[PDB]
Amino acid sequence: SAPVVGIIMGSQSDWETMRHADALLTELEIPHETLIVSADRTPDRLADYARTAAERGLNVIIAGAGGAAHLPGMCAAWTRLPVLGVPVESRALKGMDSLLSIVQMPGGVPVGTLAIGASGAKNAALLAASILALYNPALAARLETWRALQTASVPNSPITE
Amino acid sequence: SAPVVGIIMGSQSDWETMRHADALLTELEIPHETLIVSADRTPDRLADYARTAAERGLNVIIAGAGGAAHLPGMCAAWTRLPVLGVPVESRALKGMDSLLSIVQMPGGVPVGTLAIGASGAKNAALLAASILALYNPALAARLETWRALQTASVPNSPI
Amino acid sequence: SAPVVGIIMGSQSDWETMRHADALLTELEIPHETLIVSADRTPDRLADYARTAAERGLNVIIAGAGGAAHLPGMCAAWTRLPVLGVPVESRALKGMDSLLSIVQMPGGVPVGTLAIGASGAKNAALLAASILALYNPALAARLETWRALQTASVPNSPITE
Amino acid sequence: SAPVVGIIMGSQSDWETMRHADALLTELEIPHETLIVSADRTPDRLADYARTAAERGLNVIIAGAGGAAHLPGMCAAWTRLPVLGVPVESRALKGMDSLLSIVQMPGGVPVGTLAIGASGAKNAALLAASILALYNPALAARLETWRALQTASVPNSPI
Amino acid sequence: SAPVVGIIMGSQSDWETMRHADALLTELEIPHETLIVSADRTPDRLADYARTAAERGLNVIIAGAGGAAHLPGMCAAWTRLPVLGVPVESRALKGMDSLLSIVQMPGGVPVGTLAIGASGAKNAALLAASILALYNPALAARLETWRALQTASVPNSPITE
Amino acid sequence: SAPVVGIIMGSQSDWETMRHADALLTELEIPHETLIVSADRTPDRLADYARTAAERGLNVIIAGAGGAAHLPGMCAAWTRLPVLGVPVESRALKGMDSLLSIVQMPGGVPVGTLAIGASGAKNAALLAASILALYNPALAARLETWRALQTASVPNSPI
Amino acid sequence: SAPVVGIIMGSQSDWETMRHADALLTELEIPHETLIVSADRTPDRLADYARTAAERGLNVIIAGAGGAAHLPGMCAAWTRLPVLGVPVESRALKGMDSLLSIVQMPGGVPVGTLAIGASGAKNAALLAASILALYNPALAARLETWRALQTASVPNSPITE
Amino acid sequence: SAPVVGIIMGSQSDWETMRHADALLTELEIPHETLIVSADRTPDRLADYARTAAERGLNVIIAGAGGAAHLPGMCAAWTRLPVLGVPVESRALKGMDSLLSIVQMPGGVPVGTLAIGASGAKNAALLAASILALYNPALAARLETWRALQTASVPNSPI
C-alpha cells in the first residue's frame, strides 16, 4: 500500500510524458506516488522531498523534467536512494538540453538517465521495477512474465499496407 | 565473496574509463567481476553472459563502450537485471555517439545511462551501490559514509 | 525464387521507411524476404536470423532501425555477409541518434550505412543491387538501364510555379 | 570592504576558468568573495548561501560550473538577486552541456548566461560591474575607463 | 514615467517572442520602451540607440533577435549599460544559431543571455527587474511578492487527465 | 593480380586514415589499387576514374575524404559499382562534416558509409571483402578465418 | 539580354527555395538563366555546364542543393567563376547536412555560402548583384537604391497585436 | 598599388588563420590591406571602415572572426561591397559558433561564407580573386594558372 517509488516532475506540462512511468508501475502492481516538485520554483519542497524519501519508505525516485533540467540531479544531491532521470522533450532543442542537463552529472552524484520522452518514462518505470525485483520475488515473477510477453508479441513480418 | 555486480566493457581501450567503476566498487567492498565482452566482436559471449547473469547471482550489470555502443542495450535485451550504461569518450565525436547509442533505448528495454567518461564510470558504480544498499544495511551505512565524506570534503574556497 | 536479400527492421513503425527498399528490390526483380526482427525485444531471433543467413542463401542484409539502433550492428556481428544499415528517422533527434548508432561501428565489424529515412532505404536496395550485379549479368543490365533512365529523366529547368 | 559580488564555483577544477572573473572584479576595485559551492555535492551549503545572499549585502552572484551545470539555476531558485552563469568548458562536450544546462532556464527563474570558458568568466564580472555601476558613480567612471581602454588598445594591424 | 528599460528587437517577426518581456515589465510596473532596431538593416539607428541609452536614462537593455543574431552584441559594443540577450527561435536551426550568436561574446563585451524563445524573453524582463530591484525598494518588494507567489502557486500533483 | 578494389582518397593528408583500408585488403590478399583523386581539385580525373572503373575490372570502390567530402558521392554518380565512403576526421568538426557530406546521399545514388576515421577505413576494406566473398570461395574462407580470429582474440578481462 | 548569372539547382524540390534568388535578380534587372542540374544524377551535364559557363558569358553561378549537397562544390571544381552556394533545408537535419556539405570546402576551391533556406537564396542573388555592381554602374545605382530602401523601410516599433 | 581587397579580423588571435588569405592575395599580386577591426571592441572603427570602403576603392572585403562572430555581418550592414566571411576556429566549439554567427544572415544583407579556419581564409582570398578576375584580364589569367597548377600538382598516389 505504502509507496516504494516516487515519480516527481517539474510541472503539469511534464505529465504527458511522465504518465507512461505511472501507468507501467501500476501495471506491474508497484505502489508509488506521483507528484509535482519544481527544482526552480519550489527548491525547499524538493530538498525536503528528497531528504525524507528513504525514511518515508521510498526505494527509487523517477524524476522527469525538460530544458535546463535540474530536478533529477538536485533530487540525487539530497537522497542516498537511486534516482532515475527522464529527459522531457523540449520545444526548440527537442530534449537535447534536457538530456545533457540530466545525464552529465559530475562523478559522485549519479542519475540513471533514460531516453528522451515517453520511451524514457516507460523505461524509467521498468528500470525501477528491475531494481525492486531483486528483493521482491513476486514482482520478479511479474517482471519476467512482462518481459517474456513483450518478446513473444513481436510479429515476424510487417503489415505491408 | 561471489560477485553481485558485473562490470563489462567492449575492449581493453575502455579500461582507462571503466577502471573508475572498478575502484569505486572495491572502495565500498562490493564483490564484483570485471570483464571484456564486445557486443559486436563477441556477440555469443555477450548472449551467454547476459542470459546467465541472474542465475550466477549478479544483481546489477555495469556496461561501458564507445562509438556505436551496443553493449549496454544488448546486455539489457538478454537479462532481467538492471543494466547501467557508461558512454566511453570516443576519439572523433567525444562520446556523443556513445551517449546517444546507449541512452536512446526504445520503451521496453531500459539502460540507466550515466555521464560520458570517467565520471559516468564512477557514477555507474555509485548507482549500483545505491541499488544494493536497498537490501544490504551494512553497505547502506558505508554508502552513507561515502556520500557524507564527499559532501564534507568539498573546500570552501579555491586554492 | 529463393530470397537473396533479407530486409529486416526493428518494428512495424519502421515499415513506412523500409517499404522503399522492398519496392526497389521488387522493381529490379531481386528476390528477397521482408521481416520484423527486434534486436532489443527478440535478441535470440536476431542471433538465429543473422547466424543462418548465408546458409539460407542470402547474399545481402538490409537492416533498418531508429533511436539507439542496434539491429544493423548486431546483425553484422553474427553474419559474414555484407550488412547495410538504414537509420530510421526518430521523433526528437530526427534520426541523428539512429545514424550515429549505426554508422559508428568499431573497426572489425562493418555496417554500410545509408541516409536517414526513405532515401536511405531506397539507396540500401540500390547498393544491394549493385553488389548482386557484380555476379549476375541480367541484373547488371537492369541496373544499368535503371541508372541510365534516372539520368535521362532529370529535367533541364524547374516548373517555375 | 564587505563583498557586493559573490563568485561561486562547483569545484576546484573550475578555478582556472573562474579566476578570470575574480581578477576582473579586483581590477575594478569591486569587493567580492570567491567560494566553492557545489549544487550536487553540497546542496545545503548552496541553499544557505543563496537564501542569505541578499541579507549579507551581496548584489550580484556569479556562478560557474561544467557538465550538467546546476549551480547557477539552483542559486537563482533561492535568491531574488541577479544570478550570472558561466559555463565551464567540460572535457568531452567542450562546455556545450554546461551551456545548455545553464542558459535553458524556464520562464520564472532567470540566469544571465555568458560565453563558455574564461571569456564568459571575464564577461560575468564585467556584467556584474555594469549592474553595480547603475548606482555607484565612482565605479561607473572606472568601468567607463576600462571599456575606453579596451577600445583604444585594439591594434590597427596584426603583428 | 520615463523608460528605465529598453526592449529592442530586429524585426516584427521577433515580437511574438519579445512581447513576453514587455508584458512582464508592465506587470512589475517597470516603465520601458519597446522598439524595432535592426543591426543588419539599420546599423546607424542601432549605434545611435545604444550610444545614447544611458544619457536618455535607460538602465538595462533587453535585445532579441534570431539567426545570426548581432543585435544584442552590437548594442553592448556601444553602451556601458548591462545588455541582456534573448535568442529568438529560428526556423531551421531552432534558435541554436541565435543562441551561439548571442551568448559566445568575446571577453570584454558581455551579453547576459537567456533561454531560446518566450521563456528567455520573460526571464530577460525578470533579470532586468532583479537588477533594478537592487536600488528601488518598491520594485524589490513587488519582485519578492512576484517570486513568492510563483513558488506558492506550484501544485502538489499533476492533473492526471 | 589485376585490382578488384580501388581505394581513392582526396589528398595525401587522408593517407594516415586510408592506409588502414590498404593494410586490410593486403592482409586478405585482395588485389587493389591505391590512388589520390580529389573531387574538387581533380574533377576530370575523378570522372574518368569512376566512369572507367567497371571496364577496368574493379568490383568495389572505397573512397575517403574529409570536410565537405564530395569524393564518394561523385564517384557513385559516374559508376554502377558499389561505392563505400570513409569520412576522414576533419580538424575543426571532427569528421561530422565528412560524415554528413558522405552518408546523406539522396535516393538514386548510394554510398555505403562507414565510421569516421581509421575504424571506418578498416571497415570499408572488410565490407569490400564481404562483397567479393560472395563470388570468391577462397576469399570467403579467408574472411571467415579473419572474423573468427577477431572474435577468438578478444581477451576475457582487462590488463 | 544574355544571362550573366546562372542559377542551378539539384531538383524541382529545390525550386521553392531557389525561386527567391530568381525573383531578386529579376527585381534588380539582372539577366540570368535558371536550370536544374543534378550533381548525382547528371554529373556530365554539370561538368559541361560549369566548364563552359565563362565562355557562355556567365559571371556568377548560384547553386542550391540539400542533404549531401555536392552541386555548388562540383560546379566550383570546374569553373574559374565565383560560385555561391545556397544550402536547401533538408527534412531530418534541417539543412545542417546541406550547410556543412557546401561551406566546408577544402582550401583551393571556394564556395561562397549563404544561409540555410529562402534567406540564403535571396542573399545569394544580392551577393551576385554586389559582385556585378563593381563593374556595372547602372546596377550599382539600382543596388544602392535597393539597400537604401530596405534601411528606410524598417519600422520604429512593433505592431503590438 | 592602392588596395582593392580589405582583409579585416576581430583580433590578433585571428592572424594565424587570416594570414592565409593575405598570403594568397600576395601570391596572385592583388593589392590589399590587412587590418584588425573588432565589431564588439571597436564598433565605430568598423562603422567608418565599412561605410568608406567603396569610396576608398576597395572592391571586396574579407572579414574573419571567431566565437559570436559579428564582424562580417556588421561590415556587410554598412557597405554595398561584397563581404566574404571566414569563421575562425574557436577554442570550445571549434568554429561552429563562428560558422553559424556568420553564415546565418537574414535575407537582405549577404555574407559569402567560407570554411572554418585556414582553408576558409585561403578560399576567401581565392573567391575575392575570382570576383576581381571578372574585370581584370591579367589577373584572370594568373588565377587560371593558379587553378591549373593546383589541379596538375595533385599526386596520383599517396607517399
Ligand SMILES: Nc1cncn1[C@@H]1O[C@H](COP(=O)(O)O)[C@@H](O)[C@H]1O
Ligand atoms: N562499440 C564497440 C563494440 N565493440 C567495441 N566497441 C568500442 O570500440 C571502441 C574502440 O575499441 P578498439 O580500440 O578495440 O577498436 C571502444 O570504446 C569499444 O567499446
Ligand SMILES: Nc1cncn1[C@@H]1O[C@H](COP(=O)(O)O)[C@@H](O)[C@H]1O
Ligand atoms: N556540475 C557539477 C556539479 N558539481 C560539480 N560540477 C562540475 O563538475 C566539473 C568537474 O569537477 P570535478 O573535477 O570536481 O569532478 C566542474 O566543471 C564542476 O563545476
Ligand SMILES: Nc1cncn1[C@@H]1O[C@H](COP(=O)(O)O)[C@@H](O)[C@H]1O
Ligand atoms: N574535401 C576534399 C576535397 N578535396 C580534398 N578534400 C579533403 O580536404 C581535406 C584536407 O586536405 P588538404 O590537406 O589537401 O587541404 C582532406 O580530408 C581531403 O579529403
Ligand SMILES: Nc1cncn1[C@@H]1O[C@H](COP(=O)(O)O)[C@@H](O)[C@H]1O
Ligand atoms: N567575436 C569577436 C569580437 N571581437 C573579437 N572577437 C573574436 O574573439 C576571438 C578571441 O579573441 P581574443 O583573443 O582577443 O579574446 C577571435 O576569434 C576574435 O575574432
